[PDB]
């Protein structure tokens with residue numbers, strides 16, 4: 001197929017509100033899980049013709065997947081998509097919107113930036129308990145509310161493969177290396193210039209473009225809408241910048 005020089009998942013599939021939805025992991029290293037349930041949410045809408053147009057529970061994946069790592073202290077991407085395939089994940093929204101089977105237990109906060117939420121600070125909450133019981137308000141039982149995928153795969157570390165995957169099947173989950181200068185990102189096309197290795201961050205790639213010939217990925221972060229470019233950022237594409245093309249992870253409902 002032909003690869004357009006620019007692509008936005010939001011514009012291809014605007015009926016799928018989840019694609020334009022920026023989330024907040026709060027005081028928890030639950031990025032890995034957010035990136036998973038965000039892209040799963042998108043892909044469930046894209047691939048089911050809207051039949052499943054849902055907001056999948058971040059906390060449900062966080063607390064119940066035993067094979068997915070250290071929960072709020074960090075997680076493993078491939079295992080999260082495997083769990084979605086094998087057990088499925090229920091619906092569940094933010095703590096503030098309290099919708100779905102299992103809403104997020106943690107409140108929104110500001111991540112190394114200014115805005116309308118209290119600051120996140122540097123503390124980390126304890127990984128929530130696996131509950132398997134929808135809120136009283138919600139009218140589907142837990143086991144019934146499970147949304148499963150059918151496949152779970154790594155995407156090849158190739159710009160052109162990642163592009164075709166997103167454009168055909170929807171947004172993907174990706175891993176990249178956080179250096180200290182990323183935490184000061186306000187706007188523009190990010191690339192590492194200064195700062196020590198801090199860790200690894202798991203986000204959602206929704207498309208790409210160019211800005212005066214500069215190739216970039218378009219990425220939804222999970223640090224609320226006040227962070228960065230109304231919750232998104234862009235980053236250098238095609239150079240494996242901060243390993244952004246190296247652990248692309250997705251799957252399909254068929």
Ligand SMILES: *[C@H](CS(=O)(=O)c1ccccn1)[C@H](CCc1ccccc1)NC(=O)[C@H](Cc1ccc(O)cc1)NC(=O)N1CCC(C(=O)OCC)CC1
Nearest residue numbers: 028029031032069070073074075076175176200201202247
């Ligand atoms: C999210 C990144 S963050 O920037 O939002 C953040 C950073 C620090 C605190 C809170 N949020 C999380 C942060 C986890 C963390 C928590 C406390 C202290 C330090 C870090 N990051 C992850 O979940 C990464 C995601 C990732 C995976 C793969 C990849 O190529 C890039 C990024 N994964 C981890 O942190 N892991 C640590 C524990 C590992 C594990 O389970 O060990 C085996 C049992 C899994 C990987």
